[PDB]
Amino acid sequence: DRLRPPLDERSLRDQLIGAGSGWRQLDVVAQTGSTNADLLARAASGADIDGVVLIAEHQTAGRGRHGRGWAATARAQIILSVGVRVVDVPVQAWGWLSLAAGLAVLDSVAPLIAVPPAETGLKWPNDVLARGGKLAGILAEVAQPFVVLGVGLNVTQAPEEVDPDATSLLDLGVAAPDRNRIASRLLRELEARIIQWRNANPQLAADYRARSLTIGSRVRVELPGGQDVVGIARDIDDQGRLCLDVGGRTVVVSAGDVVHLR
Ligand SMILES: Nc1ncnc2c1ncn2[C@@H]1O[C@H](Cn2cc(CCCCC[C@@H]3SC[C@@H]4NC(=O)N[C@@H]43)nn2)[C@@H](O)[C@H]1O
């Protein structure tokens, strides 16, 4: 469209690689299958990917969690993956890492949209929402010693292109979205949260809770088989899992698409 310039690999490099960030390497590609895929294939080849950033202008076979698939239109989103060395950390709290990316995405964009912050938060465990619409999705995938973190931020996507519940920074009150300034600020907020995660900083758990749309509301979790538990989400436990109050007693749950029911 008219509002979708391409990126600048050079600018990003100079702002981030060694200078204003801890990231070691940065590549923009015009088209791949899945940025997660590429960084996994690359680690399985023997390459160290701790610190590597991969950004794509367009992505064709997008990966969602639990099987499903993410959809993209050329230059309309910010689509990236990054590599982190994890084996220095308990194998609990690895799920707390995909959570952490959620916060890095709500932080980077919160100072840009002019919607009441109280109507923006994080849906557990891998969605980001602004007035009911899906703003970005996150996927963490494992390949020890590394984790690969994928973000898909709808910058200028329109909903009638990838999903009817999507919205975007454009549709939220942003006339010119600067994908270079947004990508650069999000890579910084990522780096900040990952270090919190590695040093078991408890500010990570508290801030997630503060900005959760899931916590504090009746929710519904749909499980394979036609199963459905319904409860109020009281807290996240230390593995990154969802504590529910059901008839007074805690049911912990690992994943599932959660449905907010106010
Ligand atoms: N553009 C869009 N905007 C709004 N909503 C959308 C949409 N495209 C699909 N959906 C709806 O998402 C549902 C399927 N889903 C979404 C997620 C969340 C995590 C997404 C991971 C993507 C990143 S991108 C960089 C990296 N590289 C990858 O390969 N994967 C990662 N997990 N599963 C399905 O129901 C659809 O309705």
From Swiss-Prot:
Q: Which GO terms describe its molecular function?
A: ATP binding; biotin binding; biotin--[biotin carboxyl-carrier protein] ligase activity; protein homodimerization activity
> Residues that bind biotin, according to the entry?
S34, T35, Q59, R63, K134
The catalytic activity of this protein is classed by the Enzyme Commission as: 6.3.4.15
Please tell me which top-level EC class this enzyme sits in: ligase
**Pfam families, A to Z:** BPL_C, BPL_LplA_LipB
This protein's GO cellular component annotations are:
cytoplasm; protein-containing complex
pH-dependence note: it reads: Optimum pH is 7.5-8.0.
Entry keyword Cell membrane: no
Under InterPro entries, the record lists: aa-tRNA-synth_II/BPL/LPL, Biotin_CoA_COase_ligase, BPL_C, BPL_LPL_catalytic
Where is each BPL/LPL catalytic domain found?
10-198
* Keywords, ordered alphabetically: ATP-binding, Biotin, Ligase, Nucleotide-binding
Q: How does it assemble?
A: Monomer in solution. Forms dimers under specific crystallization conditions.
- Which family does the record assign? Belongs to the biotin--protein ligase family.
Q: What else is known?
A: Identified as a drug target. Inhibited by Bio-AMS, an acylsulfamide bisubstrate inhibitor, and analogs. Bio-AMS displays potent subnanomolar enzyme inhibition and antitubercular activity against multidrug resistant and extensively drug resistant Mtb strains.
| Annotated protein name in UniProt | Biotin--[acetyl-CoA-carboxylase] ligase
Q: Which gene name does the record give?
A: birA
